[PDB]
């Protein structure tokens, strides 16, 4: 028995990190979804479901490292499933039913998953016989086809293990440690508080969906995935933001164009909404100004980055946006990271205004591209300022210049 009181470490696995804050509020809603009206799954319930799923998945005999394709719209049960995978050390590839079968077959050949794990309702066609197949739903995990037998060689998942893979086509491999470092850094900025209820508009196959849900949970708040049958219909989407009393909306900029154009009075009437987080797409500034105009006193955030780090920087949009302003800054890397601009010879750009390639120094970097050491080595390079250390840095493929204060401005891809 321990000499002194153990101090429990919650940063070793996404399963632990994402649920730590919620320990203080087990009965608070973690996920909200449509039921009649709305259904809530509490922190406590979400963990119970994660744990139940994990026990049944673990009976399949898969080894730490084995990939699982997880196909489902974003729902409370899909969240329990990805948490269960995290706990077992089974990196998953998130997919949706609408993901084209040709892409799905490409994923399966590149990553060779041992299990295809779909929703209760799932009816995916085109799968290779006999790839392990299972369903998850309210009652648990039922297995239609057992995965192949194997001998297990790993004892225990650790934070350097892969947590998930996202295919861009290249397989971005993200460790626990890296994604945990991301959430740790971003929470230092206070984007989400426990009172928030966060509408995640992006589909489950998108990096931003998992990120949004993860960060929301990690921050002890309430995550509200917006089902696609609310989201593609403006009036239905806007009513949902009221019904679920949404305080923060995550989405691409273009999400808002139809809502401004067709239903500006309803947008203006979103009383519970305090904040909006965008990413993944250039926002025409006229549209943004229009949006600020309809939603005065809202905090809007601009999120720059890529799958390889989940994200890299987060920037307040000024209200009001100056009339002369032509390009929104991407600011400084998020807390715990650093980015700067480099010339074609690998030296740091000496002067403001001069365009170079963004190199990202961060604990949140991907581990590599799956089965592709040469693409890994071109993206993850020895620190150009100190190659002796062993530290690596990420060549983003993004162009940008710096202002006098050291903030960057995005200028496109190479």
Q: Give me the residue spans of the domains in the chain.
A: 1-414
Helices and strands, counts by H and E, the chain = 12, 21
Among 327, 320, 321, smallest CA distance to 304 is for: 327
Please name the residue that has the structure tokens 């693409």: 375
Distance of alpha carbon 405 from alpha carbon 408, whole angstroms: 9
Which tokens in the block code for residue 347? 């030296």
226 neighbors 201 (Cβ within 8 angstroms): yes
Distance of alpha carbon 186 from alpha carbon 207, whole angstroms: 16
The backbone torsions φ and ψ at residue 375, rounded to the nearest 5 degrees and listed phi first, read: -65, -30
Q: Which residues contact 262 (CB under 8 A, 6 or more apart)?
A: 234
Distance of alpha carbon 174 from alpha carbon 346, whole angstroms: 26
Give long-range contacts, CB 8 A cutoff, 24+ apart: 341-346. Answer: 341/400, 341/401, 341/402, 341/408, 342/384, 342/395, 346/384
CB atoms within 10 A of CB 263: 15
Distance of alpha carbon 169 from alpha carbon 150, whole angstroms: 29
The residues with which 117 forms a beta bridge, in sequence order, are 70, 134
For 89, the 3-state DSSP assignment is coil
Handedness of CA 204, 272, 189, 219 (dihedral sign): negative
The backbone torsions φ and ψ at residue 141, rounded to the nearest 5 degrees and listed phi first, read: -110, 120
Half-sphere exposure of residue 280, counting CA atoms within 13 Å on the CB side?
A: 19
Please name the residue that has the structure tokens 């929470």: 187
Among 270, 255, 166, smallest CA distance to 202 is for: 255
The backbone torsions φ and ψ at residue 213, rounded to the nearest 5 degrees and listed phi first, read: -70, -45
199 neighbors 259 (Cβ within 8 angstroms): no
Structure-solving method: X-ray
Taking each helix axis as running N to C, give the angle between helix 43-58 and helix 76-88, from 0 to 180 degrees, rounded to the nearest 10.
Answer: 50
Strands of 4-76, DSSP E:
29-34, 38-42, 68-71
The residues with which 303 forms a beta bridge, in sequence order, are 279, 314
Distance of alpha carbon 141 from alpha carbon 118, whole angstroms: 10
Determine if the peptide bond prior to 363 is cis (ω within 30°).
no
Handedness of CA 253, 259, 265, 269 (dihedral sign): negative
Distance of alpha carbon 317 from alpha carbon 290, whole angstroms: 13
**What is the rounded radius of gyration, in angstroms, for the C-alpha atoms of the chain?**
22
Distance of alpha carbon 53 from alpha carbon 194, whole angstroms: 26
Distance of alpha carbon 91 from alpha carbon 22, whole angstroms: 23
DSSP state of 269: T
- For this entry, resolution in Å reads 2.3
Among 109, 41, 110, 108, smallest CA distance to 81 is for: 41
DSSP assignment string, 158-222: -TTSEEEEEE---EEEEEHHHHHHHHHHHHTTT---TT-EEEE-S-TTSHHHHHHHHHHHHTT-E
**Given 3-state DSSP classes, what are the helix, strand and coil percentages for the chain, each rounded to the nearest 5?**
30, 25, 45
Q: Which residues contact 6 (CB under 8 A, 6 or more apart)?
A: none
Pairing outcome for strands 115-119 and 68-71: parallel
DSSP assignment string, 336-349: T-EEEEE-TTSPBP
Distance of alpha carbon 30 from alpha carbon 112, whole angstroms: 33
């Amino acid at each position: 028995s321990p000499y002194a009181a153990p101090v429990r470490d919650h940063a070793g696995n996404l399963r632990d990190y994402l649920l730590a804050a919620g320990k203080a509020t087990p009965d608070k809603p973690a996920i909200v979804e449509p039921a009649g009206g709305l259904r809530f799954v509490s922190y406590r319930q979400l963990e119970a479901q994660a744990d139940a799923y994990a026990a049944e998945l673990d009976a399949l005999g898969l080894d730490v490292g084995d990939r699982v394709v997880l196909e489902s719209p974003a729902t409370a049960d899909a969240v329990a499933a990805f948490l269960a995978c995290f706990s077992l050390g089974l990196p998953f590839i998130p997919t949706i039913p609408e993901t084209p079968v040709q892409r799905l077959r490409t994923i399966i050949g590149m990553a060779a998953p041992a299990l295809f794990l779909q929703a209760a309702d799932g009816s995916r066609e085109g799968l290779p016989p006999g790839l392990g197949m299972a369903r998850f739903g309210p009652k648990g995990v039922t297995t239609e086809q057992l995965p192949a037998p194997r001998v297990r060689r790993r004892r225990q998942v650790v934070e350097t293990d892969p947590a998930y893979l996202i295919f861009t086509p290249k397989g971005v491999v993200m460790s626990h440690r890296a994604n945990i470092a991301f959430h740790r850094g971003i929470r230092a900025h206070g984007l989400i508080g426990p009172d928030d209820r966060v509408a995640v508009t992006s589909p489950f196959s998108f990096d931003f969906c998992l990120g949004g849900i993860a960060l929301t949970l990690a921050s002890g708040a309430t995550a509200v995935p917006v089902p696609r049958d609310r989201l593609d219909f403006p009036r239905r989407f806007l009513a949902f933001l009221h019904e679920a009393a949404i305080t923060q909306v995550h989405g691409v900029p273009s999400l808002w164009r139809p809502l401004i154009r067709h239903e500006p009075d309803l947008v203006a009437g979103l009383d519970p909404l305090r904040s909006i987080l965008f990413s993944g797409e250039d926002f025409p500034l006229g549209d943004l100004r229009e949006l600020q105009g309809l939603l005065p006193g809202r905090r809007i955030f601009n999120l720059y980055g890529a799958t390889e780090s989940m994200a890299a920087s987060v920037t307040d949009v000024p209200d009001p946006l100056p009339a002369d302003l032509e390009r929104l800054t991407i600011g400084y890397a998020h807390h715990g990271a650093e980015m700067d601009v480099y010339d074609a010879e690998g030296a740091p750009v000496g002067e403001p205004g001069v365009v170079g390639e963004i190199y990202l120094r961060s604990p949140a970097l991907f581990s590599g591209y799956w089965a592709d050491p040469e693409a890994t080595r071109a993206a993850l390079v020895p620190d150009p300022l100190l190659p002796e250390s062993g530290q690596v840095v990420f060549r983003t493929g993004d162009l940008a210049y710096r202002d006098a204060d050291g903030r960057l401005y995005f200028c496109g891809r190479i």
